[model samples]
Target: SMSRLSWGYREHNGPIHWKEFFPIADGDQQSPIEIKTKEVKYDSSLRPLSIKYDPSSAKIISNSGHSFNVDFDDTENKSVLRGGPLTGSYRLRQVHLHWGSADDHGSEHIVDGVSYAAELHVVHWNSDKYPSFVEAAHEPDGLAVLGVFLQIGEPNSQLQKITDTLDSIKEKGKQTRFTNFDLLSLLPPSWDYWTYPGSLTVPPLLESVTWIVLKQPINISSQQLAKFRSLLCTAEGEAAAFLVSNHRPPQPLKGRKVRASFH
Candidate 1:
C-alpha cells in the first residue's frame, strides 16, 4: 500500500523478519518467552500483586491491524498496578489480546510447552517516574505488563463487552466509543504469577517491560475466540485480509532468571 510495508503478523513481515527493521529484535532481552518450570526460581522477595481498576476507566476500542486494543483513560491512577516486583504505581494504559489462527495455540508465553488459546496483555506505565507511556517505554523499569492466559471453556460475560464492539471496528484503523469495562472481572481467581524482565513482544521491541505472567488462565469459548479472528488486517479500500493470528513465538531465556511468586 505504500513505499514501505509496515510490520505485521504476516510471513513476509512477521516476527521472523522484524529483526531487519528493528535490530533490537534479536537483542539480549526479548519477550514472549517460554517458562520452564524446572528452571524457574521461587523468590520470597516478590510480594503479592496489588491491582485496582475502575469500571469507568476504559474509553475506546480500536483495530490496530495487529490486534483489537481497548484503550483506557490513564490521566489518573484510578486503574493502577503496584507491589509485586514493582517499586511504584504503574498506571494502566491499555488492554489487548494475542491469538493464533486456531484455538489450539495462541498465547505468546508458554508454560512447560503448553500453549493456551489466547493471551491478554494489560499494559501499564510508571506514572510516578515518567511523564508518559512513550517516555516510559524507553526505561527499563518504566513499563509493567500483566500477561493473562485464556483457555477454551464457558462463555466469559466480561469479554462479551469487548466482543460486542468488534463488528464496529472490524477493519484496521477503525475505532469506536467504548466504556464501563470491568477490567478486574476478566482476571482469574488466582493471582500467583511468574515475573521476569522482558521487552515488548511487538516491533520497536523495547526491553523496558516487567512482565507479570499469571499462572492461572481465564475462560473463553471457542466462538468468542473466532470473533477475534474475524477482524481484518487491511484498512478500508484495501484488499481485505483477516487477522487470523497475532501471537509471537517464545523467545530465548538469555540467562535471565524467571521468578515465581508461588512455590
Candidate 2:
C-alpha cells in the first residue's frame, strides 16, 4: 500500500538522484518508503502549523504533458505561509495537482515513506522576491510548498471546481475561465504536519522547498480522480493517454532530516 502510484518515476524527471543539487543526505534518509504504522517511531517536536490563505487569480495551463498547473495569478496575492524552520517570508505564487490513471492513488510525497492517491502543491516564493522562481529557487531561502495527500472516498468538492473547467481545456493549447478559484478551500482541515527541506519533485529540480506535508489527508471518489487521467499532454493524436499517471517516485532521503512539527 505504501508504493508509488504511477507517473513522475525515475524514468521521468522525478528521480531518486535529485540529491545532486545541495545539502544532500545519505541513502538511508531517502523518502517514500513503505510505512508500517505500528512499528514506527516519530519525532515529538513536530507541531501543526497555521497558514494564512486568501483568494488568488488562478490561470490554468496545460504544461506539455506534465500536468495541469495554475500559474499563480500574482495579482491576487492571496496567501502568506509561516511555520517551522522558516528563514524569511514566503508568498503564495502557484498551485498545481498531481493525479493518476486510477482513483486509488497518484501522489508523490511519501509520508513515513508512504505514497498517497493524489498530491496538491501550493507553491510559494520567498519574501525577498526577485521577480522569478528562478531567483527564489537558487537559495535555501527561496521556495516553499504545502503538500496535501488525497485519498479515494466519496467525492471531492475541491476536485469539482477543476473538473467543471475541463471542457474548456479540450485541446492542447486551450484554457478555461476558472474564476474565483479559492485555493484555500482545497486544503485538509488540519495543519498538523511533517516538515523537511527538499527538492522539487518535478523538473528544473531545485532544492529550495520547505516541504510542509499535511499529516491528515482529504477524500475524493474514484470517478473524481479519474477526471485528471482524462487530461492529455496534447491532442489525442499525440499520446494514448493524455493525463495518464502523474506521480513521481520518492527520492533518496539521502540523510536529509524529515522533521515533524506535530510529533
Candidate 3:
C-alpha cells in the first residue's frame, strides 16, 4: 500500500509531481507565468483596482504546511476587492506568500525573466454571487487574487507584523489571534497592474482566478525573509523540516493573453 495522504513542498512531492494527484496542474490556464510586457495588451476596458480593508479584518496568522496565511474575517465585506477585471465584489479571505532559495528568487510571478525576493497573495473570493469561498473556488468567475512583488530593500514594518507572529506558529497547523493589519498600505504607490485569467499557484490549482499583478514592488529586508524560512513545515512530534522554498517556477502561458491596465 503506497499512497500519499497529501502533497507538499518537497523534492519528491513538489509542483512537478503535483499533477500525479491533481491532474489539472497542466491545464491551459495555469498560473505564475512570466509577464512579457511587449506582448501584453493594454486593455482600456479594465478599470482601476478598488480595494478596501478594515484594520480589524485579519483574525489569525498560522502555519499551513508549505507556507503561512493570515486569515481574514470574510463573514462580511469588511475588506473587499472589486473593479479590476472583475464583475462583482470579491471578499478578502486570506493572505499568503511564497518564497525561494535564500534570496536570488522567491516571487511566484516573473516579470520579463526577473524574480523578486518574494510575492504576496491577497486571496479573495466572489461574494456577490457565491454564498461562500469554497463554492466560489470551483467556478470560472469565482476568485480574484491580487499579487504583489516584494523586492529586497528596507525592512517593511507592515510585513514585520506577520513575520513577528511566525515564531508562535512555527509548526504546521498552528495558529493564533492576529489582527489590526494595515493590509492596504502594503502595496506600492501605483494601481497599475497586468491582468490575466489563471489558476492558483499552489495545489488544488483551481483555474478560477482573475489575477491582478501589481507592477510596482514594495520593499522587504533580507533579514525579515530569513524569518519565513525558519518556519517548520512539519507539525510538532514529527521530524522537523524547514520550509525554505515554496515557490513554483513560472508555467507556460499556452496562448492566453495578458492585459495591462496602463499603456
Candidate 4:
C-alpha cells in the first residue's frame, strides 16, 4: 500500500482520501475527526500535561505552494521527561498560525467541542535518538503536540511579531526581516491542559501523536485574528479551498478515552 498524503477540503478530497495517497493505518485515524466528547471514558495514562514556557526565535517562510517555519535559535532547552508510554522527548521546533477568512473562527483543530478564531502549533522534534518527526511517528511514543486555541477577544500584543511582516511574505517563498520577538509572553499564564492520543490533525494521519490541548485559550482581538486570515491558502474554487479550515470533523471515540488535567 502507498503512503497517504495529507488532504484538504473539497468534498471527497478530505483527509480521509489521504489513505489512498499513502497506506498508513487505513485512514481510520485520519485527522480532522470531530470530537463530541460528551461520553468518552476518562483515563489516567493520559493526564494533564506540564508546559514550560520560554522565549525563542521564530522564523516564517512561504514556500511557493506551501510554507516553511523554523524556531528555537536562541537557547537550548533540556527535555524534561523521556518517552514514557508514547515515544520520545519532542522538543519545540517552531510555532506558526493558521486561520480563515472571517474572524468567527479558522483553526484546524478543536478543543472541548469548540473551534477557535485561529490556531497556533508549536512544532517539536523528538530526541535526536529518533531524528525527524516522520521516523518518530512510526514509534508508539513518537510525537507530542501542544495545541493552543486562539479566539477573537480583546487586543492581542503577541501577534504583532508575526503580522507585522505581512508585506514581506505577501509573495510566495518570502523570508521576512528578522527582529527580536518574545515568544514566551504569548502563552496563557496557567498551564492547565487536556490530553489525548491522536494524529497530527494534518497529513499522514499518524496515530502515534499525543495531543495536549490547553483549557485556557489565548485571546486575540478581531484585528489580530485577521492576520491569520491573510495566510496563504489554496485559490478560490480549488479542490483545496477548504484548507482554510485545518480541522476535520472529530472522529468517533472508537472507545478511546480523553483525559483532562483540571479534573
Candidate 5:
C-alpha cells in the first residue's frame, strides 16, 4: 500500500487530513500555534531555563521517514532540562528538524505572523516523573519540547555537523553513528522563551507537551537548508519522494494563554 492509516506531510496524508486517524489533531491543545507578540503575556513567575547537554550524549543520526533525527543518551540524566515552567527534570531523548523546499516560511511555529526557513525540535521526556518517553506521552505534564527557529543567514558550524551526516542517512531507515555533538552552541545566547500547553506536532498528536519556543533564532545558509531537502521520505527500495516540507500549519489558540519568560 502506498499510503497507510498513519500520517505524512503530503497532499493526500497532510495535516488537514490527519484528523481522520488521529482525533487529537482537532483537540483544543494542539501545537504549532501562532506566537503573536502583542497577545503574549509576560509571566515573571516562570523561572530561567536550566539546560545541560553533554556533547557525548548524542548517539546516532537517522532518517525517521519524516526528518533526520539525532538520538541521545537519556539513560543517566546526563543531559536534561529543568527550571522553566517545569516541576521535574526532563531528559533529552532526541532532536529533529522541519523545513520547506524554499526559505520563505517553513517553521511550524509562527512568531508575530512570521515564519522562518526551518525549525529545530529538542524532544525530552520527564524523567523525574515518567518511567519513559512512551509513558510520558499520555500525561499533560510529561514532555517538554524546546523549539528553535532557523533563519537564512551565514553558515552555522554547529549545524554543519548534522548536515555532514545527511548523506549517510539520505534514505529513510538509514543511520550512522553520531556523537560529540555540541548542541548548546547552536542555541541563541538569550534564554527568553514563550511557553504553552500543547500536543506533539506529529502523529498520535498527544496533548502532553509543554512547549518552550526560544525568542531568538539561529542562522543557517541557503545551501545548508537545501541539504536537508536532499533527504528522502521513502524507504531504500520505494519510489523516490523528497521530504521538501514537513511542518504542520498553526492550530487555533483555543483560549490558550501564551506566557513569556521575559518581559
Candidate 6:
C-alpha cells in the first residue's frame, strides 16, 4: 500500500498530478492565473488597500518543505490588512515567496502574459469573524492573500533581511528567531491591485482566498534570488534536494473576472 503524501514540486508528483489526490486542484476558482490587463475591469467600487504592520510582529523564519516562511504574531490585531477587497480586517499570519530555477520566469501570476522573476505572498486570515486562522481558511470570506511580484533589478535592502536568515533555515523543518521585520517597506510605491476569487496554490488547495495581486513589482537582484534556491524541500536527514522552483503555473480563469483598482 502507498501513502497519499506524494504531492510535491517534482515532475511526477507536482501540479499536474495534484488533481489525483486533491480533486479541487482542477476545480473552478483556482489561483495564479495570467492577468490579462486589457480584459480586467477597473472597479471604482473597490476600496483602497490599507495595510499596517508592526515590525515586531514577525516571530520566526523557517523552511516549510515548500517555501521559506516568515511567520508573524497573529494573536493580536497588530498587523492587519483592511479595505481593498475585504469586508473586515484580515490579520497577518505568515509570509512566503515563490520562485523558479532561473530569474527569467518564477512568479505565480502572469501580468499580460509576462511572468516576473518571483512572487511574494503575504497570507492573512479574517480574524474579526473567525477565532483562528485555521477556522477562517475554511470559509469563503476567510483568507486574503496579498501577492507582490518581484522583478529582477537592483537589490532590495529590505529583502536582504529575509535572505540573511536563509543560511540558518536551509533544511526543511528548520527555523530561527527573527523579529522587527519591516514588512510594509517591501511593497511598491502604489497600492493598485487586481482582485479575484481563488484558491491556495499549495495542497489542501482551498478556494477560500480573495486574491489581491499588486500591479507594480518590487526589485530584487539576481544574487538575492539565488539564496532562495539554496533552501531544501527535504528534511534534515533525507537526501538533500534544493527548492529551486516552487511556483505553480497559471491556471484557467474559469470565467472569473479580475477587477483592478486603477484605470
Better of 2 and 4 by lDDT: 2
lDDT of 6 by residue, 1-263 (tens): 11167567887778888888888889898988999988999999999999999999999999998898999999988999999989989999999999999999999999888989999999999998999999999898999999999999999999999999999999999999999999999999999999999999988889999999999999999999999999998888899989999999999999999999998
| Clash counts for the predictions, in order | 0, 22, 0, 19, 0, 0
Q: Cα lDDT for residue 16, model 1?
A: 86
Q: Model 1 residue 10 lDDT?
A: 83
Tens-digit lDDT track for model 4 on 75-136? Answer: 35532223323343566656666565566656666655667787776666566557665677
Query: Which lDDT tens digits does candidate 3 get at residues 1-263?
Result: 11245777787788888888788899999998999888989989999988899989999989998799999999988899989899989999999999987798899999988899999999999999999999999998999999999999999999999888999999999999999888998888998999999999987899999999999999999999999999998999999989999999899999999999998
lDDT of 4: 0.56
lDDT measured at residue 216 in model 1 versus the true structure, 0 to 100:
94
- What TM-score does prediction 4 earn? 0.75
Q: After superposing candidate 2, which stretches have Cα over 4 Å from the reference?
A: 1-48, 61-64, 236-240
Which tens-of-lDDT digit does each residue in 156-229 have in candidate 1?
99899889899999999999988888899899989999999999999889999999999999999999999999
> Compared to the true structure, candidate 5 yields what TM-score?
0.98
Task: Put down candidate 2 lDDT per residue, 173-263, tens digits, no spaces.
Answer: 5665455677777887777676677767665456677777777899877877777777665565554446677666666555466555554
Q: On a 0 to 100 scale, what is the lDDT of residue 189 in model 5?
A: 94
**Greater-lDDT candidate between 3 and 5:** 5
Model 5's alpha-carbon lDDT is 0.93
Pairwise TM-score winner, candidates 4 and 5: 5
Provide the TM-score for each candidate, comma-separated: 0.98, 0.79, 0.97, 0.75, 0.98, 0.97
By lDDT, the better pick of 2 and 3 is 3
Question: Looking at candidate 2, what is the lDDT of residue 4?
Answer: 32
What lDDT would each prediction earn against the true structure?
0.94, 0.64, 0.91, 0.56, 0.93, 0.93
Clashes of 3: 0
4 versus 6: better TM-score goes to:
6
Runs of candidate 5 exceeding 4 Å displacement: 1-5
- Rate residue 67 of model 6 by lDDT: 95
